[PDB]
Each structure stands twice: as structure tokens, then as C-alpha cells.
Symmetry: D2
């Protein structure tokens, strides 16, 4: 084949720097990018109305936590609405995030759509006019983006079509982000749903990630300028066999070593409906696994950083400080777990043990 | 692999019937789907303002031509704006088209976008919310759609990435149309630009169409419910060697026999900046080619049906009838040429001999 | 992409002529290419020793049948040993075949080998030094070759790997034959084993043949110079639902129209353990199917032309003429069935109704 | 997709152990596997007859060098003939190699063959009966194998077909080795021929290696049980621009980080017609490159370990010891260079500075 270089040297240097800053040692990502429909369900649980103001106040509570959180969070993923909101003190949230050391990110996909002729498999849409939105977001403060693809384990799933198509669409979104100075987080999520055992999840994760990195190569994507956000390798939600944290860790780190090139700057796990603590305990075993792990291995957590906070908050403005503390507890814990220095040992208040699992068809 | 049938038997029967009606013997397609920006250039040429009303009047002039045109046109491709306009007598254009025997079609792509890391190659966008637009259009009278992909011949073009990506995106659009009862016209256009000879165009067309039909198979597309709209195989615009019409015909029909399955219902050529007459003369040689041609071989022409009409019209309302006649001449001629019964022999007024070639980068 | 033409015009003309002569109207193929190990089992059934001489005598009995067979057989596929044997009158068998109007063919594969990490799937070997063997065989009288690949229908079979790998290896063998003036018969056999219904066989056949024709395109194979030898689409051996001959015919011809380009010169079905008569009755329905069938649709039968002959022969030299008649009956019948002119109506002696099914693992 | 595990746990453990032992720190590979035709040219250069005995004596001179070589050589690749020869003291060479700490390897490919319809591109043959040869070789003392594929940089080379086909055939050979307890060395050589600059070699190497690791994944190959033998990234032989050793090192290590998973056990470079010293100097810069190199980075050298030895030997039995010393010099140097501890600084006798470049068409 033949080169017509996608990016210049300076564009490459800019992408590699943003990627590296996000997952610097001790740091992970807050995923705060729930659309209106999905944050509505979380506000319902605490009997709070889904208005714009409550969404603004709840995001302000996460983003203005005290400075124990600054070395813990390298990046915060926002939903379009929040990127344009302001804290009570007048500053725009992107400014709030950057003044505490963080990089601002934006969810740019437009959700999943059905693949015809499949057993309920999806691809994800959002490419239309993506270039133009990325250039606006970059001007508005965001340096990284996020696009989620969803695969399912089943008797005949994932299919070759679902794998191919989802890999190809992640590569297209990645190319378009890099052109506009934004680091793409590639997220090929394999759902936990079903009763498969640890080893089926591990084999399917290996096959999906191999298709992903071939697609990214075919689309000329600069890997040092990307991050990956995969599922850990766990057994299925309904699996009756029990696996230990070190088995989850070994499986995960062995699946990643077989597929992800050492040039990828880091890997930022999703939590997948693991509880707050379980999600920290698995991250910490992953980072204690004796194999050579040539990339950062950190967190990009949504529900596993927010659950105790949401429940402490309760929609009451006077619980603000109790709610922030509960998030700061979890941020400290995952900042230790991504270094393999997390000590479960009671400690802290000790964030939720309640599962955050929701089942991911229509739901 | 394993079946979860994309379509039911009745959905299949509906798709095959619409496809077959469009390209019934003697019939072809009027492409009248120029967006606002592209019809502006044609109205400029005749010193006429690009307002909505002039666009409405000019489309009315094509769509209400007398009944010599009824057996000639099986289908008319419209731009979104026109699908909602009305003739002077109060009827909506879809109604005008159907009362004269025609099937209404709608352009649903949103144009081409650059592929990074390539020598100026494009893919085409428009998938976002395509399902929802197709279901509305189907309710509003359209039964078929059109989506154009553009490839270029050059020293290192088309690339494997451009071929793969364009094939995959045509397959996605096709799947989504079939789900909503619309027959997709798949259009993998290979531009005429450049100085390549007939045999390079033929080899590139064979390679592109093979990738297209594999992609459509991987996406489970029902082929009897589709039409193809390819370029004829011609030498490049700047090629100095001269080829005859029978060489153009043989090359074209030999490239199609090697790639397009007999299940495809028909093939509706684009004109590509050939003049009105040349476009008719090539169609008629294609349909006189002695090889076995197991699909309809007809026209889906934009500029090659409209040029003499536009020039006769001149933006003057009193030339209406002179302008219609000029379109009806061309419609009769292509209705004969798709049967291999067209007699060039002076005849008619004899539509333009002027090339309609425009060069297809920014332009 | 870019051309460095695999073949010259004269090489192409030679290949297309041999292909067309083999499947001229009324003609089919005798597959007489059982290796030593497989003809041993057939000679055991008639209590006859598997010596070289009995193998020679039995092949002589097929190849010197009287001239009712001349217009019926366009081609005869031999095993390497037989290509070098002589009839009792001194002539080499290739000479015997050619003097009766036939084209000589040679089996050049070296059997199937296991694909690791699969549920018992195979690929087929034989490429090593294939070029050199083809050039010798061409000098020794053969003009076409045969290479068999085997796929299986099961819960997770065929796999994507089995499909891909078998398609790729057929394309390699085809390229190498064409370079040496030999027409390759491409044989992607999907076994009848298992209890799947007609529609699973049809879907799997469509997916396999699409991968095959894409592979042949990627390897630059001249399609007019090839023949295909696929399975008809039938339900599985152990399927309890019953399908009629016209359902078998429709399924088959609908699967072929969706995948096989009109340039392929012909399609020469295998029998697959159908009895002599059933194999003739299905061929004749296939050729009565009302759809447009743009290629020859004929037979390349092994067991379905030989069973009554073998049993009449019995290893006794005095039954020679009774055995030949029994083969000539079957040759006449398939020559009518490939024209859709076969009349079952008792008639003839009426060749075996006994199934020729053997189950195709180790066996 | 779905698992039917290619290998058991114990087979995996055996493969990973052999792979790891070969490229233990300080160790590299002697490639002594020149076929008869290729060692003939090297014996001609020193006016020595190409008999079996001289081939035996010359291999004995390499394999019985004194024990300074034991910690330097983890593995020795032999040609089939040599695997069955004996040293003068009666021991079989495999025994000689193992008693000095080494692992015995065997070349199992059967050379390259032309790909039709390409600009002189090749694939490589040798799969036929590979399973059976691997099981014999394993019994005869070999634990690893070697199979070389050759790609060329040119105006339209490598083509997509050449890349695909060569990747697929390396994956097939690898699968078959692993089944028989042999560690496959995968060697996708990109020739140095031509006038391309460093950056074209680097881009082509990235594209080839991405296709290779996808193919190995599709064929279920256990990566911990493999080694890679690629070209370093250098400019072309006829390139007029000059590049430094650190540019060669950076390019090489940046191309490998982008494509080769961390599970691959090691990477054993070929020399490619670099002189003895240049080949050591590049290995040592590669291993001083500041980036994270998660696999061993060592040598699998043929001509770059033998040139001064061959020339000192001269076919004279009395120069034996002078010839061995000359090989031991080079072995020490590459054992230091694979640790990034090699000091060019005059030193030693100082092995050839003469280029070992031969041009690799017919030649």
C-alpha cells in the first residue's frame, strides 16, 4: 500500500500529549455523560424530578468536589448539555474541570440501532456531521471524545457482521476525531448479560479486540492518540460458577496482552454494573497481575463512581457535602486501585456493595 | 453461519414487485434529485434565479410532460423539497408521478465526506436517523431510494480502504431501506475523471462491484429487491485514445457479467457527463451486445435527459411547451435505447451533442 | 487497484473454449476419479479384489461404452493412475476419451486435513508443486482439473475460518490451473450430513458461494474459464420434514442466482449420495425451474452414474455388456435431465433407487 | 464466535517454555538453514566444492565452536539434510546443539512461487504433508520451525493479494506446527530492494504486520508459543538519502509497537544483507531505543554471523580454529547487542564491513 499521511507531526504530538495526560499514573476518568433519558432513571430512584436544574446541580456536586479528587481524575466525559452549563459561581463546567487538573471529554455517538437479519444485534450511529461537531467541541473546551458500541454474548452472538460492522464504525469515528484534534476513546463494550462462564467472555473479547485493532489499522488511525474502553473479562450475570478476583484479573490481562498493541496509550475500563467496591477490587487485581502490562490500566467509571453519592444526595441540597464525600471516597479508592495499591480492609465509609447491573436490551 | 431472517416473505414480495415495475421493458428512470446547491448552477446557466418557485416550476415542466412519456419512465428520483411540492393544479408531485404510471423515489444520502490518510478519497454520509426518514418517505409516497458513493481512478486510487468503506456504507443504507419497504438503488459511481484508458476503467469497475456484492451479502440484503446504478465502462475524460461505442458496450457488459448476480432485478446506468445523444448511443450498443444479459439494462439519467429541455426553457414560462417536447424527445430515445431499438439517424430535433462533463472534486 | 494481467487473450480464448465444450447442451461429466482407497470400497461391495488390473478393467468398461454415450458426456475426470493406463486394444485412456468426443480431466487435490480449533472442519491440501503437475498433465492429455473442498452444516459449522480458508485455497488452485492451460472445476461441497431442513442448506450455500466468488475475484481468476461443482440445495440426510423435487429445484436455482455471476461458463452438480434416479429427477426439476438460468446446469456425477453398472458387472468379465448398458441408461437419462427433457415414467431398466449416501467423517 | 480449543493447557505450557528458552536474555539464533542450492553459492565464493562432506564439515565448524558461544545462542535453525548428519566424534548434530544449551529448529517451507496477475509477487509453498513432517522432526529433536514469506516494495507492491495471501499461509503453517509441539517462527520478510526511503519501509512494515497478526488470530494461533522474524525498518538498498542507526532503531521499534501484541514471546530479526557489523550496530540501537519494548528483541542471523567465518575457513581444514574464532567474535557481539550493551569501539578482529546484499528476484 501507499501513504498520504492522515496527520502531521504536530497533530500527532498534540494527540499523544492529551492521551498521556488523561491516564497519567494515579488517574482515571469520571464518566458523567448520561443523556437526559438515562439520568432521568437515576434521579427517579432518589425521588427527584428530572429537570435541567437538578441535572445541573447534580453534575456540579460531582465536578466541584474538594481537591482530594484532583490527582485522582485525569478526565471527565460530559453529555452535550452539561458542556454548556455553568456552576453557581458563574464558571462554565469545562473551566471548572480544567482548573482542577482535568481534561474535558464529550460523548459524540447518537446511540445504537438494530442490525437487520441478526439476533437483536446493534451497531451505533452518529457519524453524520461528526467532523463539524468535533471542531465546535474542540473550540468549546473538549479534548477527547467517547463513542460506545455494544456487543452481546449468546448462542449465535456476536455474529461476524456485528463484529465487523462495529469495528468499522469505531474506526470511522476515531479517524474523524483525530482530524479535529480530539482523542477518541474507542469503546467496544461486550455486555455481561447471559449465563456464559469466564472463558467464553475471554474468547469473545479476544476476537472482538482483534477485529477492532485491524479496523483501526485499515483506517490509518494513530494509536498513541487513542484510548481503549473495554469490559473486563468476567463471567455472565446469570453464570452460576464463581470466579475469584485474580481469575477475573488474569483473564482480563491475558485477553488484552493478546490483542492490544503496546502503542495504545492506555486502557480505561468500564464497570458494567459491578458495584462500587467490586469495580475497585477488580481494577486493583488487574494492576497486581504479574504479567507485563505495557499500557496504563485505569478506570472510566459511570455508576461505580456515583451510586453512594446519588443516594447520599437524595435530591436534598443540604446533603451536598455528604454526597461529595461519598464520591471522593470512591475516587480515592480507584486512584489507588489503578496503581495496585488499593486496600479493601473495611475502610472509608465503604461505597456500595449493591449491584448496579441493569439488563441491556429495552432497558 | 446462521439465519434470523431480515425480511418476511411478504416484505420480499413487496420489494421485488417495486423493483420489477421500475425497470419493466421500455422503461428507465428520470433522476430529478439535484439538491438546491446543484440545481442553482443549472439555473444560473440559463440566467434564471434559484428561488423555490423556479425550482418548482422547472420540476413541474419535467413531471407534467404529455403522455408520450408514460411508457418511457418507470421511476422518478426526487430531492426532499420536491417530494412535498405541488403542481399548479393543486396535486402533490408524487401524485402527478403515480398517475402517469411512475414510481416515486427519493435521494436519502447526505453527500460525501473526505477519508483521512487518502489521496482525496471520500465516503458518503447519511445513515443517522435513516430508518425514521425512510418510514416517513414511504408514508409520503416514495417506494425507492437513492444513495450515491463516489470513487476515483488515479495512480494509487481507488484505495482498498475507499473500496471497502464505500461498499460497507451502501450495504448499511440498503439494509435500512429494505426494512422500511423501500427499494434501494445502490450507486457505486466510478468517476470518468483522469486520463485512464478503457481497460483500466473496466478492471477497476470489476474490482469495486465485486466488493459491493460481497458487502451486500454480508449484510443480508435481498438482491431481487435492489437496483444497481453504476458507471458504464468508458475511457477517462482526458484519455487521448479513442474507443468505439461497441468497445464501450462490450467492456461494460463484460464487467457486469463478471460481478453482478442474476438475482439483481436491474441495472440503471448513470450518464456521467456524456451528452444526451452519446448517453443514448451507448445505452443502445450495451443492449445490442451479443452476450447474455440476464437483468434489465436501462437508464437512470439526470443531465442526459434535461439539457436540451433546460436550454429551451430558458426560464421563460412561454417556452414551456418547447421545453417539454425537448425532454419527451430524449425520453423516447432512451426508451428505445434500453431495448436496443434506438436509431440515431438524424431524427427528432436531435438533443444536445454538448458534453455535460463537470470535474468532480470541488465542482 | 492495478492490473498486471494474469493471462493473455489467447490463453483466455483457450480456457473459455474448453470450458464451453465440456458443458455443451445435452452434455455432462463422468466423475471417475476415485483414488485407490475409495474405489477399493466399491470393489469390495461386489466381492472383487482391489488390484490394478480390476481397477483398469472397470474404468475400461465405463470409458468404452458404445456410442449412445458420446453426445451425453462432455468430460471425464480421472485419477492420476488411470490417466496413464491403456485399454485392451492398446490405446491410452485419454485417447479413448477424446476419440468419443470427450475432454479429459484429472483430480489434482491431495485430500482434506483438519483445521485446528474447529469442530472437526477441514481444508484441503495439494498446492505444493501443483504448477509442475498441471504442466505435465496438460502435455499428457488433460484439459481440466478438479479439486474438492468439504464444508459441514452443524450448530457452529461452517465457521468463518472454514469458509474463508476453503474459498482461498480453491482460488489458489484455480489460479495455478489457468496459468497452465487447464480449466479448474471449483468444488466447494457442502455435505448433506445432519438434520437441517432445506432452508438452512440454502442459506449456508448462499454464504459459502458468496465467499468463493469474492476469493476468485481477489485472486484474478478468469471466470469464463472455470466451472462450478456445488451441492444441490437439499435438506439434510436425517431431516424428518419432506421436501418435493420442485422445492429442491427452486431452492437450488434461487441460491445459485444470488451468488454465481453470469460469466461462469457452467455448473456441474455433484450427487451427494442421492440414488441414480433421484439425482436425475432433481437435475431435471432444476432445469425446468421457471427462473432465468444464465449458465449451463448439468451433472458431474460419480456414484449416480456407476451404481447399477458396478452391481451388474459383479467383477465378472462376461457381464461386461450388461454393465455397460446400465451405465449407458444412466448417461442417457442425465443427458435428458440437463435439458429438462427427462421423463421418469418407469422406462429403461430404471437405475438404482438405492441411496448412495455414505457419512463423511472417518468414512 | 465459538471455541473448540486448538490446544490443551499442557500443549500451551510446552510451547511457551520452548519459545521463552530460545530468546532468554543474551541469546539469539543462528540461522544455518541454507538449502543445498544456496550454500553452494557461499562455498563457490571460497573456491570450495559443494559436496555433502564440505557442507557437513562447514556446519560442524559452526556448531562445535567453543563454549564462549553457549550463552549467546538459544537456538539453531537447520536444513533438513543437516538434521540427520553427525559430527566427526559420532554425535548427531541435534545432540551437539542441545549439549551446548541450544534448541534445535528446522526450516519447513518449500520456497516461493509466483502469484499470477501481480508484478512479480510470490507466496510460499510447503503445507502439503506438513503435519506428518512436523511430527517426525519433533521425534528427531527439533522444537521450533521456520517458514519464510517474501514481500517486495515497489510502485504497486506489495499488493492487497500478496499481503493477504502471505499472512494466511503463515497462519496455516503456524497452526500445523503448534499441533505437533513445534514453535513456529513466523517470517514475513519485506525485502530491502528498491530505492524507497525509511518512512515507506516503516509504513509497509506496519501494514504487513497488522495483516499477519489478524490472520494468526483468525486461525486461533497461540501467540505466546510463537516468535516473529521481521526485517528491521531500513531505507532501500538504492535509496540515496542516508539515515542514522538511531533513526533505523526508532522506526523499527515504532513499527513493532504499533502492530505486535505483547503476548508474542519474542522478535528475532533477520539481517537482510547488512554486513556483520552493521547488523550488530542496528540491533544494539534497537535495544537502546527509549520506548517500552515488551518482548525480547534479538537476532536470527544467517550471513551476518557467518561471513568472516566462511572467509577465514576458505575450505581449508587447517583454518578451522581461525574460522571458529571469527564466528565466536560475531556471536559475542550480537549477544551484547541484544542487551543494548554492544560497544562497536574497534574491538575484536572486527567482523566484515562488506555488504552481504544479494538482489532477491532470480538471485
Amino acid at each position: 500500500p501507499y501513504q498520504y499521511p492522515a496527520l502531521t507531526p504536530e497533530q500527532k504530538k498534540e494527540l499523544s500529549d492529551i492521551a498521556h495526560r488523561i491516564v497519567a499514573p494515579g488517574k482515571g476518568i469520571l464518566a458523567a455523560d448520561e443523556s437526559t433519558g438515562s439520568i432521568a432513571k437515576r434521579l427517579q430512584s432518589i425521588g427527584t424530578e428530572n429537570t435541567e436544574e437538578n441535572r445541573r446541580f447534580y453534575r456540579q456536586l460531582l465536578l466541584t468536589a474538594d481537591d482530594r479528587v484532583n490527582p485522582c481524575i485525569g478526565g471527565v466525559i460530559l453529555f452535550h448539555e452539561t458542556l454548556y452549563q455553568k456552576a453557581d459561581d458563574g464558571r462554565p463546567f469545562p473551566q471548572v474541570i480544567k482548573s482542577k487538573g482535568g481534561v474535558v471529554g464529550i460523548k459524540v455517538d447518537k446511540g445504537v440501532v438494530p442490525l437487520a437479519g441478526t439476533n437483536g444485534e446493534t451497531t451505533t450511529q452518529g457519524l453524520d456531521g461528526l467532523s463539524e461537531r468535533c471542531a465546535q467541541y474542540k473550540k468549546d473546551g473538549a479534548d477527547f471524545a467517547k463513542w460506545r458500541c455494544v456487543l452481546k454474548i449468546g448462542e449465535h452472538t456476536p455474529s461476524a457482521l456485528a463484529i465487523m460492522e462495529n469495528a468499522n464504525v469505531l474506526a470511522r469515528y476515531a479517524s474523524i476525531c483525530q482530524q479535529n484534534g480530539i482523542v477518541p476513546i474507542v469503546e467496544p463494550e461486550i455486555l455481561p448479560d447471559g449465563d456464559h462462564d469466564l472463558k467464553r467472555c475471554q474468547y469473545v473479547t479476544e476476537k472482538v479486540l482483534a477485529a477492532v485493532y485491524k479496523a483501526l489499522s485499515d483506517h490509518h488511525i494513530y494509536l498513541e492518540g487513542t484510548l481503549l474502553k473495554p469490559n473486563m473479562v468476567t463471567p455472565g450475570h446469570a453464570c452460576t460458577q464463581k470466579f475469584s478476583h485474580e481469575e477475573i484479573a488474569m483473564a482480563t490481562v491475558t485477553a488484552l496482552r493478546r490483542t492490544v498493541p503496546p502503542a495504545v496509550t492506555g486502557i480505561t475500563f468500564l464497570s458494567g454494573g459491578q458495584s462500587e467496591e467490586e469495580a475497585s477490587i477488580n481494577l486493583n487485581a488487574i494492576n497486581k497481575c504479574p504479567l507485563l502490562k505495557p499500557w496504563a490500566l485505569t478506570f472510566s467509571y459511570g455508576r461505580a463512581l456515583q451510586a453512594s453519592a446519588l443516594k447520599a444526595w437524595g435530591g436534598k441540597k443540604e446533603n451536598l457535602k455528604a454526597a461529595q464525600e461519598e464520591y471522593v471516597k470512591r475516587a480515592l479508592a480507584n486512584s489507588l486501585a489503578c496503581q495496585g495499591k488499593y486496600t479493601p480492609s473495611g475502610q472509608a465509609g465503604a461505597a456500595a456493595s449493591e449491584s448496579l447491573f441493569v439488563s441491556n436490551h429495552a432497558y
